[PDB]
Nucleic acid binder design. Structure first.
Lengths: 135, 234, 91
RNA sequence: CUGAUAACUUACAGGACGCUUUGGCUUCAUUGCUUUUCAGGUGAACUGCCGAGUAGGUAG
């Protein structure tokens, strides 16, 4: 089904829907159901979220009671974009030591094509990351 | 109340306004165009009665077109005369006493001094009636033109006329009214059963205003001695 | 009854070809063919006159006593091609 | 109710032949553009695994 948001921020709201899809897949140990957004426009991810192959989980039911809900292409994570930040460039060098560290050099000119990260976090640790998703 | 008649394209008129001047047709002919329009509406609405009118001339073009007369009875044509004709395009504004589109079109007179007077079908939209002078003059298209007031300054002579003509070249003398030779009497045959008199043409100079209102609106005044279409101010 | 018509033609001539407008009738006191004209926009332009146009609509009369070609409607209906009078009053 | 009422200007056409504009020429002296000037949104999109790897993949 397609869940259409009608109240806002589509970035930090579609990322919450995937965390419920995340925690569902470790209770039941299933990896079949996938996610895609029909309105994947350049300005924003969109207000439409669909799953193909969840609505009985506690998140989607309580959000349904309020005024806001309704309840080919490939969307894959690109973790090379997580390596392009300068905190991630230092993570890359620490592995290669574990050797001249001054022999390395920055790119000084990089171009990035439409990475669309959705911000999420971990529950095993207290640590944050992003969902850099392209077509 | 003001009624607007735009774009009366006349094909073959007489430029002979007088036995003297050749140019725009006599103002009595413009008065006959208005008063026959007044008289056609009185078939349906019998209280109409136009008081005055205003003329906005575009595009004269006076030419010596000929006129082939028909054969007359021993059958030949009569004697020939040089003919001066003109092609007046003008917008007429009338001050009404107080009407359907079908009534306004079919009551239009179809001649202006022997010339085919017509309005295009695409200009039938612009026959609306207005209550102020400002909205009527902003309503009509074909903006460049003249508004035809009378020139009232001491023309007792042709040398008085030509002195005004050489100062401003576009000053346009014509026939303005009629001057009687004898008081009207009963004749055995007169056109439509009225008293008949014998008159003569009165020549006046005709100005133009850039655009106050009484200088523009023309009307027919009746005196015992003569008849002249004057502006309302004079 | 009113019945306005607006007629408009579309003539496809050859390359660079002649047009034949109407022409004037004046008394003689060098130019041997002078056209009738109006002013359209800011320029002179040949016309085909209003009396010339009305004489073409009224070529109906094919009831004169030896009728072959229709004549222009009028009293004792004349032919200006051959200078004669069909429907002469002796008929 | 308009110097009112009515109105076919038409046909035909060869402007042509010939043509040296040219000579001469100094634009040239002098020259101070200067004084003073915050682009800021950087709390953060982290930490591991695989690989011989400034390649490239994936975990939370």
């Amino acid at each position: 089904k397609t869940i259409t948001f009608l109240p806002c921020n589509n970035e930090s709201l579609a990322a919450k829907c995937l965390r419920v899809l995340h925690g569902f897949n470790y209770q039941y140990e299933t990896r079949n159901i996938g996610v895609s957004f029909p309105l994947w426009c350049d300005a924003t991810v969109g207000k439409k979220i669909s799953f193909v192959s969840l609505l009985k989980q506690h998140y989607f039911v309580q959000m349904e009671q309020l005024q806001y809900f309704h309840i080919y292409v490939s969307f894959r994570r690109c973790q090379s974009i997580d390596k392009l930040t300068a905190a991630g460039l230092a993570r890359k060098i620490r592995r290669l030591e574990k050797f001249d560290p001054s022999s390395f050099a920055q790119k000084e000119h990089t171009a990035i094509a439409h990475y669309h990260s959705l911000g999420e976090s971990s529950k095993q640790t207290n640590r944050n990351f992003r969902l850099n998703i392209r077509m | 109340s003001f009624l607007v008649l735009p774009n009366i394209r006349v094909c073959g008129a007489t430029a002979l306004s007088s036995p003297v001047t050749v140019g725009i047709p006599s103002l009595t002919a413009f008065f006959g165009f208005v008063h026959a329009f007044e008289r056609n509406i009185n078939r349906t609405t019998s209280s109409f009665r136009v008081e005055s009118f205003a003329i906005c001339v575009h595009q004269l073009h006076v030419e010596k077109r000929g006129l082939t007369a028909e054969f007359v009875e021993t059958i030949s044509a009569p004697a020939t005369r040089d003919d001066w004709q003109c092609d007046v395009v003008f917008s007429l504004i009338l001050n009404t006493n107080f009407i359907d589109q079908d009534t306004l079109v079919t009551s239009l007179p179809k001649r202006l001094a022997r010339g085919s007077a017509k309005i295009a079908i695409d200009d039938f939209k612009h026959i609306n009636s207005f209550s102020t002078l400002e909205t009527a003059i902003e309503s009509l298209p074909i903006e460049a033109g003249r508004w035809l007031s009378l020139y009232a300054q001491s023309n007792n002579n042709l040398s008085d006329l030509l002195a005004a003509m050489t100062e401003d070249h576009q000053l346009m003398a014509s026939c303005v009214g009629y001057h009687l030779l004898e008081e009207p009497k009963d004749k055995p045959n007169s056109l439509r059963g009225y008293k008949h008199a014998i008159a003569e043409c009165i020549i006046g100079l005709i100005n133009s205003i850039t655009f106050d209102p009484n200088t523009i609106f023309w009307s027919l005044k009746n005196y015992q001695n003569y008849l002249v279409v004057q502006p309302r101010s004079i | 009854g009113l019945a306005i018509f607006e007629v408009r033609a579309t003539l496809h001539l050859p390359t660079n070809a002649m047009v034949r407008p109407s022409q004037v009738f004046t008394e003689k006191e060098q130019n041997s063919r002078v056209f009738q004209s109006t002013t359209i926009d800011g320029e002179r332009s040949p016309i085909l006159g209003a009396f010339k146009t009305g004489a073409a609509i009224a070529t109906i009369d094919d009831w004169y006593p030896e009728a072959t070609e229709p004549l222009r409607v009028g009293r004792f209906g004349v032919h200006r091609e051959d200078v004669t009078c069909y429907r002469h009053p002796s008929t």
